[PDB]
Short mmCIF file of N, CA and C in Angstrom, two decimals:
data_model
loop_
_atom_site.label_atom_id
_atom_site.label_comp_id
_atom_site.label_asym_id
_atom_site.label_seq_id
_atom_site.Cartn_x
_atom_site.Cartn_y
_atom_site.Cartn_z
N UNK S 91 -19.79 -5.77 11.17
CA UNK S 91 -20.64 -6.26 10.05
C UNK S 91 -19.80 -6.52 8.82
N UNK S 92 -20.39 -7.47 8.10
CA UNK S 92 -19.70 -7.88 6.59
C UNK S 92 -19.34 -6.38 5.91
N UNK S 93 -17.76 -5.79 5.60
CA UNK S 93 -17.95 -4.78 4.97
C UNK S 93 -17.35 -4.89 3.62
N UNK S 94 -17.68 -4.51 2.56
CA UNK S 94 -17.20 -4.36 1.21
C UNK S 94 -17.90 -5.36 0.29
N UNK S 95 -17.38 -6.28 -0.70
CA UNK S 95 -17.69 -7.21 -1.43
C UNK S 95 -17.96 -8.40 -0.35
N UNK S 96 -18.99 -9.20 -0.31
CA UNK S 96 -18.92 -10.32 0.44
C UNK S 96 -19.58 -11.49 -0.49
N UNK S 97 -19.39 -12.56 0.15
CA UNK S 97 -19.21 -13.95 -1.03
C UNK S 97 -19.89 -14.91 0.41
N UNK S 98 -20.95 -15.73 -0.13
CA UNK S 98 -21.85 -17.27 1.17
C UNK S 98 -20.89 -18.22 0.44
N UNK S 99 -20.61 -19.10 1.28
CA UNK S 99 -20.02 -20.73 0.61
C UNK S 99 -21.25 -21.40 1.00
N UNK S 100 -21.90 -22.21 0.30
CA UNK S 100 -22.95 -22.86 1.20
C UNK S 100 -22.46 -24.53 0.72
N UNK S 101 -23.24 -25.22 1.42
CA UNK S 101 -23.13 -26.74 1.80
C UNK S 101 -22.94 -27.17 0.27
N UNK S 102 -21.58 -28.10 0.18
CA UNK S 102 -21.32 -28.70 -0.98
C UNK S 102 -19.89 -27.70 -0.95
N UNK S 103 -19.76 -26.56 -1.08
CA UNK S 103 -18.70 -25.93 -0.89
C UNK S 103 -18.21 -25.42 -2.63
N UNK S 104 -17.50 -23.99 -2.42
CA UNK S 104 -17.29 -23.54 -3.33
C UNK S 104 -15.96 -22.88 -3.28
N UNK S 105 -15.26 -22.24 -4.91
CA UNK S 105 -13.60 -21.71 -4.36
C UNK S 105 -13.95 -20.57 -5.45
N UNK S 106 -12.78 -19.66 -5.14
CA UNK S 106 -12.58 -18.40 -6.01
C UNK S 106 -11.20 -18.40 -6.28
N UNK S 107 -10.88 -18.76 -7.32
CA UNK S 107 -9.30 -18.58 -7.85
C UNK S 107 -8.52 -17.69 -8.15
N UNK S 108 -7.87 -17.17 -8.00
CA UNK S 108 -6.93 -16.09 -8.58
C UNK S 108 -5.53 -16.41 -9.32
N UNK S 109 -5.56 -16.11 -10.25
CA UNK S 109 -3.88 -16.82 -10.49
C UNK S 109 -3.41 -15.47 -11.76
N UNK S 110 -2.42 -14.90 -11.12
CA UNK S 110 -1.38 -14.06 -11.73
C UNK S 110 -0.95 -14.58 -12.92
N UNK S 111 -0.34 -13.65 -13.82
CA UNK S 111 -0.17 -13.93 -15.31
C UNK S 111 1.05 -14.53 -14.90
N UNK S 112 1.23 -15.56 -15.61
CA UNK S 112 2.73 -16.69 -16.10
C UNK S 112 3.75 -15.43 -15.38
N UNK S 113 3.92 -14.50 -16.40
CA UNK S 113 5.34 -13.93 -16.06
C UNK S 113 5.21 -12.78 -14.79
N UNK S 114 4.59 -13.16 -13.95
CA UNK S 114 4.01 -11.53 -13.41
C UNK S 114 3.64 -12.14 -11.86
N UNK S 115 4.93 -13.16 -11.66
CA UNK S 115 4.24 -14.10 -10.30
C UNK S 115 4.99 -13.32 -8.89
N UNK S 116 4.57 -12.37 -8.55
CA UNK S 116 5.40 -12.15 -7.14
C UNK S 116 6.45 -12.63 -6.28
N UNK S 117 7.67 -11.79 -5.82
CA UNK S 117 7.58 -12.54 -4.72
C UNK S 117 8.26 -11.45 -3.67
N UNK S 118 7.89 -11.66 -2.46
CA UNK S 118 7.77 -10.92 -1.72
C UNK S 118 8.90 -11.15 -0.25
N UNK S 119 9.36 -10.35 0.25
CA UNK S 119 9.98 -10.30 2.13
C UNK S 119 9.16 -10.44 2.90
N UNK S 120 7.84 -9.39 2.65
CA UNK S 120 6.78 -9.11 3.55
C UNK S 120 5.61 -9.18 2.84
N UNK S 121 4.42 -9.98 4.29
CA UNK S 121 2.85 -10.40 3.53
C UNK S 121 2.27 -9.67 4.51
N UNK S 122 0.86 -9.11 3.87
CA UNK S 122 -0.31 -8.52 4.82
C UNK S 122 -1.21 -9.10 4.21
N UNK S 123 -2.18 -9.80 4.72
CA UNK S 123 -3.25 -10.69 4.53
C UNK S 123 -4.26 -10.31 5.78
N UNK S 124 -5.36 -10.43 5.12
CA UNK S 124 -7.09 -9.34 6.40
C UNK S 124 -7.99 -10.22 5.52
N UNK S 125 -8.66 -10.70 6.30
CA UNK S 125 -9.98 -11.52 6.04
C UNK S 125 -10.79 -10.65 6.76
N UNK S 126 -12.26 -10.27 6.44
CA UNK S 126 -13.84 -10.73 7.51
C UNK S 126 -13.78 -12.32 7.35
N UNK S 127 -15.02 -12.51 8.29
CA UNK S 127 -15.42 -14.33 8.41
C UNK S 127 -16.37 -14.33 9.09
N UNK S 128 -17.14 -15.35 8.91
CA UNK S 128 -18.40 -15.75 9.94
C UNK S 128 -18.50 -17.01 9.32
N UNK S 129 -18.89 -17.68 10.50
CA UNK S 129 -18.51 -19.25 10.08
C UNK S 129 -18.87 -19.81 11.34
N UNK S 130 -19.47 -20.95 11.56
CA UNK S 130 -19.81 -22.55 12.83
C UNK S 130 -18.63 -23.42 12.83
N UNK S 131 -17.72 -23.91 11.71
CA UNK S 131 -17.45 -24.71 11.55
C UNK S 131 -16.07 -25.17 12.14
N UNK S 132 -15.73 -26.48 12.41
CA UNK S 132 -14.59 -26.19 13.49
C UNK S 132 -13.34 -26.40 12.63
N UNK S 133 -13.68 -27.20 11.61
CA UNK S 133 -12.26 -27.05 10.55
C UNK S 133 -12.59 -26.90 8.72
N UNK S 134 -11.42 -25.88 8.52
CA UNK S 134 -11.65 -25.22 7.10
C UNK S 134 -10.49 -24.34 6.71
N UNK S 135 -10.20 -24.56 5.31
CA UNK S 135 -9.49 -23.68 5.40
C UNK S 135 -10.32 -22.23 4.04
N UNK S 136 -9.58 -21.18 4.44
CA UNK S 136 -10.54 -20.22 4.22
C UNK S 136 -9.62 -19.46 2.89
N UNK S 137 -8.28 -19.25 3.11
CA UNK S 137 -7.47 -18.85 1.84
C UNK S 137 -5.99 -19.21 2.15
N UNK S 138 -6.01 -19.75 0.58
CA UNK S 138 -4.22 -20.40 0.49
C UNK S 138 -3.40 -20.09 -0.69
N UNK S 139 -2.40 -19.15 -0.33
CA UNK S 139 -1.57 -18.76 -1.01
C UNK S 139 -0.61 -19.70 -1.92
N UNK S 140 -0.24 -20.57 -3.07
CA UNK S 140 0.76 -20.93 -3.64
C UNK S 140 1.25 -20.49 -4.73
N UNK S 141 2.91 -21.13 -4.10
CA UNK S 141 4.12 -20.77 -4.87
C UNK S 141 3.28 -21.91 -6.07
N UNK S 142 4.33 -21.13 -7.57
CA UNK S 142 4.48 -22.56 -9.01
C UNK S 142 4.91 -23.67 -8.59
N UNK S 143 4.56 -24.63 -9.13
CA UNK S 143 5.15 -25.86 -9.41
C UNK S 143 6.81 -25.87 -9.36
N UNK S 144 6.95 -27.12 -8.30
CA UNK S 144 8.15 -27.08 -7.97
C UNK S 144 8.95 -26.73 -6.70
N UNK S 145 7.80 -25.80 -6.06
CA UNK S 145 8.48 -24.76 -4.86
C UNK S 145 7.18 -25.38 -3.84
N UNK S 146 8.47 -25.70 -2.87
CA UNK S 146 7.07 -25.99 -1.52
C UNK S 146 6.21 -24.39 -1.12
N UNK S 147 6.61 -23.68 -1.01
CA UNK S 147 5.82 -22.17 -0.78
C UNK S 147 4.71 -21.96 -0.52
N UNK S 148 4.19 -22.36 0.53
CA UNK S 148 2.99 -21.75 0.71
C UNK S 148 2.63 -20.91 1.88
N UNK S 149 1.17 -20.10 1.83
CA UNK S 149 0.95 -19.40 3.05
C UNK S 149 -1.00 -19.71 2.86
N UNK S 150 -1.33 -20.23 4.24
CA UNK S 150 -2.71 -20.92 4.92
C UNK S 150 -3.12 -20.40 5.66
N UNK S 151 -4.67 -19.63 5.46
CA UNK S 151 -5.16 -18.93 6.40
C UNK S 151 -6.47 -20.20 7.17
N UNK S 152 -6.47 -20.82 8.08
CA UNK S 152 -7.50 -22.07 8.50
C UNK S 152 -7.88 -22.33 9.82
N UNK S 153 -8.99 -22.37 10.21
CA UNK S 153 -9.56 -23.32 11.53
C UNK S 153 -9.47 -24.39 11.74
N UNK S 154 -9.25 -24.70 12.64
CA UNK S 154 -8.44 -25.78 13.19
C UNK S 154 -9.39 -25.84 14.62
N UNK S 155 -10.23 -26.62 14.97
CA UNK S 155 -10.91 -27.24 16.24
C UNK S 155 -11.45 -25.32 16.60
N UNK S 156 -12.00 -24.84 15.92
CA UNK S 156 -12.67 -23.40 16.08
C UNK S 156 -12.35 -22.83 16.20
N UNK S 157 -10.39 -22.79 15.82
CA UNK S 157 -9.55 -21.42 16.02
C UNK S 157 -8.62 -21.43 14.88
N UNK S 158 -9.18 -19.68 14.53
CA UNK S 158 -8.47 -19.12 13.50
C UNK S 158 -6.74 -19.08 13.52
N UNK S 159 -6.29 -19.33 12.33
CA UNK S 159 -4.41 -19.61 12.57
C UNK S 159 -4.12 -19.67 10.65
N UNK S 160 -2.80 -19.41 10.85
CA UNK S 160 -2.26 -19.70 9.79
C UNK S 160 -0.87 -20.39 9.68
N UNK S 161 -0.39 -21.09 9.17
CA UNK S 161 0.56 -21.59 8.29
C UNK S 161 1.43 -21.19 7.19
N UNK S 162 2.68 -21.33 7.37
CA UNK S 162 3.13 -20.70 6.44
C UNK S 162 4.57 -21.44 5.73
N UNK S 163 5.20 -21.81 4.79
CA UNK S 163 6.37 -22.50 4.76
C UNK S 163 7.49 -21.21 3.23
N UNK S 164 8.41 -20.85 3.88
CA UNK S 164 8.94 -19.79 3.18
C UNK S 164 10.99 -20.64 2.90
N UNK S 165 10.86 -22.00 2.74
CA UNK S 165 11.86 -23.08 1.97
C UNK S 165 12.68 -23.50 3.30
N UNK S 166 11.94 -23.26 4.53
CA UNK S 166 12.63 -23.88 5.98
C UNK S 166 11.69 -24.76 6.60
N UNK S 167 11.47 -24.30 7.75
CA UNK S 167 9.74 -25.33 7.80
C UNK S 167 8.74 -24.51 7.87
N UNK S 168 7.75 -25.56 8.36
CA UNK S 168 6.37 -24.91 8.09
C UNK S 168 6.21 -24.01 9.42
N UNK S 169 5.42 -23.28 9.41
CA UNK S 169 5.69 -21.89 10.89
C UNK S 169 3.89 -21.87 10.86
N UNK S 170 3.46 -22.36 11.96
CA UNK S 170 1.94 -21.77 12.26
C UNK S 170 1.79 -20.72 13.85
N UNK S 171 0.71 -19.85 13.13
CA UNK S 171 0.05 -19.11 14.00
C UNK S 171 -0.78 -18.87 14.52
N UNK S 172 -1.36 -18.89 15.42
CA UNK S 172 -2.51 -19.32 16.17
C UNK S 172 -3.18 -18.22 16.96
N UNK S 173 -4.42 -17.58 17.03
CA UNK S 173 -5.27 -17.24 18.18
C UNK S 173 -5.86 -18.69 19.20
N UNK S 174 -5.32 -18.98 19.96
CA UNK S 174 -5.47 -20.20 20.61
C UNK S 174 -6.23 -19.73 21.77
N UNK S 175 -6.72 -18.48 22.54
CA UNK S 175 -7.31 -18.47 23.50
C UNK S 175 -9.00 -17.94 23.32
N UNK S 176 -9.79 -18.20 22.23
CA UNK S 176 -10.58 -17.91 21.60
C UNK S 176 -11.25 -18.38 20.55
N UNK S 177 -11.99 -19.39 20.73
CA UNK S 177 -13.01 -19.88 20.05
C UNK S 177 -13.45 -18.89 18.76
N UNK S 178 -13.76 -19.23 17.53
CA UNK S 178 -14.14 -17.92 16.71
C UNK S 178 -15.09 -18.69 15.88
N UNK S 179 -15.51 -19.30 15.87
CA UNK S 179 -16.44 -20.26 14.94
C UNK S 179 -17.70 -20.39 15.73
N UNK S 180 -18.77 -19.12 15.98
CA UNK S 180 -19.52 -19.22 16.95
C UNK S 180 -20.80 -18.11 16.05
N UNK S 181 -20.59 -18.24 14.40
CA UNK S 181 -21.14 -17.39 13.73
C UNK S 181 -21.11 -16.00 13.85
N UNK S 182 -20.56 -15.17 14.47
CA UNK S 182 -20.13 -13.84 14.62
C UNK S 182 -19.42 -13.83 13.05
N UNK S 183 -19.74 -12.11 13.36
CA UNK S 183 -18.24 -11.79 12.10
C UNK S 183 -17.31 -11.21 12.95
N UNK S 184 -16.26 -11.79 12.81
CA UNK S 184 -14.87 -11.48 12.98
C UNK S 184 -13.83 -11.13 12.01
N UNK S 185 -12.33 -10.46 11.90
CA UNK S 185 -11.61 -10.06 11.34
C UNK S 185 -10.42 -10.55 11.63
N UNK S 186 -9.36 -10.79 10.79
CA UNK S 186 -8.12 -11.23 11.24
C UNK S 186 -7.27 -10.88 10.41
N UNK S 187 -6.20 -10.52 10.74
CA UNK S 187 -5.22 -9.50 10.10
C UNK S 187 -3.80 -10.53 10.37
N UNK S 188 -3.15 -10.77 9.18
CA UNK S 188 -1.95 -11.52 9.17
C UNK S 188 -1.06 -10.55 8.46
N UNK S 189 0.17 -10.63 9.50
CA UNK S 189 1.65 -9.76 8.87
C UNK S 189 2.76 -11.11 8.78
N UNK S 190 3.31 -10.97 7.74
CA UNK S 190 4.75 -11.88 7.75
C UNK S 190 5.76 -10.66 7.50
N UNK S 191 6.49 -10.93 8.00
CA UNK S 191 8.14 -10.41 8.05
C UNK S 191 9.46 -11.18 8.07
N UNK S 192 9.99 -11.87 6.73
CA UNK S 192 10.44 -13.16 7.07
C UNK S 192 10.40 -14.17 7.52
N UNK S 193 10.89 -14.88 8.42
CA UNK S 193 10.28 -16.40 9.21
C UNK S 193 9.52 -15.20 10.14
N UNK S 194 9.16 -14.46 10.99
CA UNK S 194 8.34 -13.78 11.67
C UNK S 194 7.31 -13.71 11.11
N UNK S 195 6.22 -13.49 12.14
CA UNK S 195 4.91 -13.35 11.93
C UNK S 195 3.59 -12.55 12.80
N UNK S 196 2.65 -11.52 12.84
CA UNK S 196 1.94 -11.38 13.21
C UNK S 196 0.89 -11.89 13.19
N UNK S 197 -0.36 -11.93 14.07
CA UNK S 197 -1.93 -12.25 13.94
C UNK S 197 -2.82 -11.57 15.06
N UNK S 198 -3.65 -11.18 14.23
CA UNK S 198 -4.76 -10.60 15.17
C UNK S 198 -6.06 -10.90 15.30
N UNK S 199 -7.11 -10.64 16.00
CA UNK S 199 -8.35 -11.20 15.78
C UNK S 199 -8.95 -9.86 16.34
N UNK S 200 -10.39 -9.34 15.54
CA UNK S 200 -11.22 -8.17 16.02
C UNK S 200 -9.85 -7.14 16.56
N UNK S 201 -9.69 -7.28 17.73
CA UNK S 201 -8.81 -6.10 18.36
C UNK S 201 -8.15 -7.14 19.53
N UNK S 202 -8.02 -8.33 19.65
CA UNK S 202 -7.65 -9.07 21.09
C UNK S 202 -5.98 -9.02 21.06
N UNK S 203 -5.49 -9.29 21.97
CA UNK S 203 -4.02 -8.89 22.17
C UNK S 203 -3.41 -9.71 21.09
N UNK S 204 -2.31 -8.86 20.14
CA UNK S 204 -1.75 -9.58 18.89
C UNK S 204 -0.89 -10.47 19.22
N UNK S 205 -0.81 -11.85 18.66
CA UNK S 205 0.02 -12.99 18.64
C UNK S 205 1.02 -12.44 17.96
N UNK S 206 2.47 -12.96 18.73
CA UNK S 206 3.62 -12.88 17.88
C UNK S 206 4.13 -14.39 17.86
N UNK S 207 4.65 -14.56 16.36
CA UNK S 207 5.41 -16.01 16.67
C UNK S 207 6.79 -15.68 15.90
N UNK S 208 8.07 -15.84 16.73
CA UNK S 208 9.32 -16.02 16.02
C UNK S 208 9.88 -17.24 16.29
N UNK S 209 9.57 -18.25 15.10
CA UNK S 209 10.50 -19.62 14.74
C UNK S 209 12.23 -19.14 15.60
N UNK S 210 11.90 -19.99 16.98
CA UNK S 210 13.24 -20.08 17.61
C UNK S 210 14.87 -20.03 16.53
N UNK S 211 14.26 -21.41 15.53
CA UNK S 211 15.74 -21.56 14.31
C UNK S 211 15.13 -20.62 13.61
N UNK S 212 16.49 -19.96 12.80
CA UNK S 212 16.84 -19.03 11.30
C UNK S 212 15.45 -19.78 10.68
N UNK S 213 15.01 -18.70 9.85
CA UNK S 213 14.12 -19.28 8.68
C UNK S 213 14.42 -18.28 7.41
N UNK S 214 14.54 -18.63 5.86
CA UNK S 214 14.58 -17.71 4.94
C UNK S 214 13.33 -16.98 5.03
N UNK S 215 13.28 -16.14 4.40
CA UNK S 215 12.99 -14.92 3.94
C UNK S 215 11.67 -14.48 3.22
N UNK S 216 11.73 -15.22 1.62
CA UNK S 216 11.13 -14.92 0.66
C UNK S 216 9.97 -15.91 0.41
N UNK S 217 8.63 -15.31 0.18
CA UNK S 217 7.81 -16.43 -0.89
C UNK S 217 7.70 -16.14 -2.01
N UNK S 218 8.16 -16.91 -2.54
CA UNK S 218 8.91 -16.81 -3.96
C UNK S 218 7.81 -17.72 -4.99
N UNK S 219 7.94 -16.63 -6.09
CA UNK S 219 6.73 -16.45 -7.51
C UNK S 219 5.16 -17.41 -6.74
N UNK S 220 4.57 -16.41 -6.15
CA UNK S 220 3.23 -16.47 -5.87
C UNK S 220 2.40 -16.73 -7.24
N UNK S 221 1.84 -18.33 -7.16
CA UNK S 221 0.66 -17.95 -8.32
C UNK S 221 -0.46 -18.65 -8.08
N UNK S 222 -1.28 -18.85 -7.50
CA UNK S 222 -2.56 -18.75 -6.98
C UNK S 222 -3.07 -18.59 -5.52
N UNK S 223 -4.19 -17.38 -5.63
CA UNK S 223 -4.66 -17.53 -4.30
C UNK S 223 -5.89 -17.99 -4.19
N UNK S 224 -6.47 -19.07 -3.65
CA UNK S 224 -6.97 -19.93 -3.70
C UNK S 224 -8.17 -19.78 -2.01
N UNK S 225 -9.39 -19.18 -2.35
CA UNK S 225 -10.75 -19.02 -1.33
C UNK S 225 -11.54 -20.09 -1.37
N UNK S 226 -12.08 -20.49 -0.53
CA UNK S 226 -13.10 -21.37 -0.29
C UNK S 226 -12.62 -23.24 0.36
N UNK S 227 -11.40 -23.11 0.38
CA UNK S 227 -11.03 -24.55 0.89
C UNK S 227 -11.11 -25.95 -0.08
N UNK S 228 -11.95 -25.78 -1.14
CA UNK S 228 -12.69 -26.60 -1.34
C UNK S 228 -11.55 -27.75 -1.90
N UNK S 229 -10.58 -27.04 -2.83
CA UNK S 229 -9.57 -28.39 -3.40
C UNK S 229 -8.44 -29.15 -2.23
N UNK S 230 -8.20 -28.31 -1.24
CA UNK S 230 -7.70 -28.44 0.26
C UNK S 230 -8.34 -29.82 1.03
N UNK S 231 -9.18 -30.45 0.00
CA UNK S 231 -10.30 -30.74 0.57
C UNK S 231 -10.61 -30.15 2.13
N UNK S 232 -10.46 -29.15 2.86
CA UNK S 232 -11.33 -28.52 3.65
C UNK S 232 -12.28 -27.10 3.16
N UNK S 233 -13.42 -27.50 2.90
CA UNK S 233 -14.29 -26.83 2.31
C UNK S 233 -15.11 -25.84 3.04
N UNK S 234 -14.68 -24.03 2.97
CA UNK S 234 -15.27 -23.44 3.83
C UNK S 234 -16.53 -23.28 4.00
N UNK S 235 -17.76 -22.75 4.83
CA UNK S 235 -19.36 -22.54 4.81
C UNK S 235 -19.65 -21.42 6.02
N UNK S 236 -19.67 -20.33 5.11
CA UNK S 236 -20.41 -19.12 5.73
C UNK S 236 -19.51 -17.69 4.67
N UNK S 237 -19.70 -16.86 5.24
CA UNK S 237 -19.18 -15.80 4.90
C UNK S 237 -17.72 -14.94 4.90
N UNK S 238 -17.43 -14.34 3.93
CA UNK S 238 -16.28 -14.31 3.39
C UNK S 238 -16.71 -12.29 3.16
N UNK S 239 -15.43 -11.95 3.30
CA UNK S 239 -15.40 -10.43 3.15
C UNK S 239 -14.41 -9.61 3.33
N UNK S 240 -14.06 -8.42 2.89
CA UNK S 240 -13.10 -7.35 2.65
C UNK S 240 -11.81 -8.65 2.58
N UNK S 241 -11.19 -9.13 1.61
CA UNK S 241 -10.11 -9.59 1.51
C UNK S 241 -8.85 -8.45 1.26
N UNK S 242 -8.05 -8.85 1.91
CA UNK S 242 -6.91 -8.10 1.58
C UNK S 242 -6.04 -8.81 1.55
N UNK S 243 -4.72 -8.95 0.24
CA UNK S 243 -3.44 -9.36 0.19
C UNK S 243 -2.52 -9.06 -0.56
N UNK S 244 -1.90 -8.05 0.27
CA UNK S 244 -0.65 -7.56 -0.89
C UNK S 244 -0.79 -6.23 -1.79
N UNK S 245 -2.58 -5.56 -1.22
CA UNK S 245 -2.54 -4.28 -2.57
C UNK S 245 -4.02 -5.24 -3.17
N UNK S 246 -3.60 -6.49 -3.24
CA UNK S 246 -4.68 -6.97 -4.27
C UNK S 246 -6.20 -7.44 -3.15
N UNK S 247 -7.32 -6.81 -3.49
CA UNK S 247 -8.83 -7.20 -2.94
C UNK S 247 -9.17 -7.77 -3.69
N UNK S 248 -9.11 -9.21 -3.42
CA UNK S 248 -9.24 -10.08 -4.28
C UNK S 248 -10.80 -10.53 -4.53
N UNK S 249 -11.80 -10.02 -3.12
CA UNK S 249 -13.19 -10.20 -3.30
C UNK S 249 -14.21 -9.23 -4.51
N UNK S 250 -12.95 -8.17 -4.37
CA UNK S 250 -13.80 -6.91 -5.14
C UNK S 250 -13.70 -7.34 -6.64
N UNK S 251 -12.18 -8.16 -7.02
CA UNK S 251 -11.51 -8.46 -8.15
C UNK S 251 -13.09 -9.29 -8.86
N UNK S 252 -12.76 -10.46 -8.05
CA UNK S 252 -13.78 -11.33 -8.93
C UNK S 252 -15.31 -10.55 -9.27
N UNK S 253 -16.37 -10.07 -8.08
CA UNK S 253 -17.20 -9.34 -8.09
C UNK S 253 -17.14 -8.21 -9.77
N UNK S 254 -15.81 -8.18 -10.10
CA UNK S 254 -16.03 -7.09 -11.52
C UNK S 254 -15.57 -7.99 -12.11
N UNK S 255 -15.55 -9.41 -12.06
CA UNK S 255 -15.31 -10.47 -13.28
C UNK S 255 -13.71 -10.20 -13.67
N UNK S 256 -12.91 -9.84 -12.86
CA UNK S 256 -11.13 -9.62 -12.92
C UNK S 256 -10.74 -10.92 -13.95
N UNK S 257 -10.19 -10.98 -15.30
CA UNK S 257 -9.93 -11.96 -16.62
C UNK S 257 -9.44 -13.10 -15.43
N UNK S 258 -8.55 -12.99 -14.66
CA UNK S 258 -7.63 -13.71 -14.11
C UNK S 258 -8.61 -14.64 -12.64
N UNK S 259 -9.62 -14.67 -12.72
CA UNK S 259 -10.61 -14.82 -11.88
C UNK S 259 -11.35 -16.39 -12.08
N UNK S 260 -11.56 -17.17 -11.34
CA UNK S 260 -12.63 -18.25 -11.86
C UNK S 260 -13.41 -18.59 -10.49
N UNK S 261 -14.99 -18.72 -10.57
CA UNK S 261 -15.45 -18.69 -9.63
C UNK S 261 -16.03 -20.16 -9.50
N UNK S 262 -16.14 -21.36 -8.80
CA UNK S 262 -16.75 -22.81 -8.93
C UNK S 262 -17.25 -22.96 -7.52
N UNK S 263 -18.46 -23.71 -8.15
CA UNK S 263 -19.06 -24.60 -6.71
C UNK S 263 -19.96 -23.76 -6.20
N UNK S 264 -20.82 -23.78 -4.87
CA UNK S 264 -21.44 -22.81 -4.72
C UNK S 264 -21.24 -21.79 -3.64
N UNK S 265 -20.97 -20.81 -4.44
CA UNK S 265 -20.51 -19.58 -4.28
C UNK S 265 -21.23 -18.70 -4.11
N UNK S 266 -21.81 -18.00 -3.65
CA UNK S 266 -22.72 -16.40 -4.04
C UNK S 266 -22.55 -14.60 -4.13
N UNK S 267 -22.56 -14.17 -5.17
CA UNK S 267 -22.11 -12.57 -4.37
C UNK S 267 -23.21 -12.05 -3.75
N UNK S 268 -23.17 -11.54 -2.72
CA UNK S 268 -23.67 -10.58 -2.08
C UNK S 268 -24.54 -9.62 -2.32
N UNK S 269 -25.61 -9.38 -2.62
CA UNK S 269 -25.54 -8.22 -3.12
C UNK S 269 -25.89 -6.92 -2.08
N UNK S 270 -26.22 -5.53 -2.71
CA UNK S 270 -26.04 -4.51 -2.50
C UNK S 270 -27.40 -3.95 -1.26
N UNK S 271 -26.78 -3.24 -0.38
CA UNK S 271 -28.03 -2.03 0.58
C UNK S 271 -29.08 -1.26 -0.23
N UNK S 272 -30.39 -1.41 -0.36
CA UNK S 272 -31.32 -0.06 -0.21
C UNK S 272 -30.86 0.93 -0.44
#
């Protein structure tokens, strides 16, 4: 079930921004990124990590023909990861747990056997000065629709963030919080 802060995208589509102070932009060896999701839809992307201006850097959490995967480019090429034997866009809630470790990468889905992908060529290392993380698809133009929950990346819960109005927060389009159990 949806656990923690949860957020509807509904039709027309909506985003939740995050963007770190100017001087205060991360950068990291290693990423842990955990979505919930429930979703029909066969393509979307759901959260995207970018580097500042200037730096190709990014990291893409997205469906692709009804399977959850991510993308990632750390200044070599782009490296995607895939649950490819599993349909996940079938309105269930599901979970997916992304590890980076340099050009390496983990992915998981619910509990099904974890994907490993190691880029055959060398890849660097670092994603370097992280400054926005970017929910809902919508400027991607792939615009997500359904449910969104327990985000995790890096230390930062970025669903809980906005939910207490976090300064660094902007919420557009249509969006909804969740609200609370009885």
């Amino acid at each position: 079930g949806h656990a923690g802060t949860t957020y509807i995208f509904s039709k027309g589509g909506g985003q939740i921004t995050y963007k770190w102070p100017p001087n205060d932009r991360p950068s990291t060896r290693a990423d842990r990124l955990a979505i919930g999701f429930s979703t029909v839809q066969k393509e979307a992307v759901l959260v995207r990590v970018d580097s500042s201006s200037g730096l190709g850097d990014y990291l893409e959490l997205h469906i692709h023909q009804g399977k959850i995967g991510v993308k990632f480019n750390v200044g070599t090429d782009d490296i995607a990861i895939e649950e490819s034997n599993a349909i996940i866009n079938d309105g269930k809630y599901h979970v997916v747990r992304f590890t980076r470790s340099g050009g390496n990468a983990t992915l998981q889905v619910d509990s099904w056997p974890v994907i490993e992908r190691y880029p055959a060529g060398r890849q660097l290392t670092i994603f370097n000065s992280q400054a926005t993380i970017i929910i809902g698809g919508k400027e991607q133009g792939q615009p997500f629709q359904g449910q969104l929950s327990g985000l995790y990346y890096n230390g930062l819960k970025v669903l809980n963030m906005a939910a207490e109005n976090d300064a660094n927060i902007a919420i557009v389009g249509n969006v909804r919080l969740v609200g609370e159990v009885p």
